[PDB]
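User: Run a structure prediction on this.
Assistant: Running it now.
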Amino acid sequence: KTHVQLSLPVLQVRDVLVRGFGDSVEEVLSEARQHLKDGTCGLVEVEKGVLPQLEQPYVFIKRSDAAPHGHVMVELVAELEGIQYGRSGETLGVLVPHVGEIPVAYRKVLLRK
């Protein structure tokens, strides 16, 4: 399927144990996609002071369309030293590995895979 219905656990930035997916734009996008497939991906909602507490490169989920079965259609955009790789809509949050942190909420997304 070109899209996959996911429910992403929303994590508080200060709880996150593994604060990025790796060391290159290509690796973080690769790893983010694998964790999304494996159900091992969390979402951190971006506010003032969040991003400097996470590791670059960042992986964002961004709204790709204006929401089947409550699931917002999203795609992945990476960012390193202020350059983004991809072009998409509004940021829903930054993806991180989920290693058992207790979430505060769930974000229903339809991921362009």
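The beta strands are 3-10, 41-44, 58-63, 72-80, 83-85, 91-97, 105-112.
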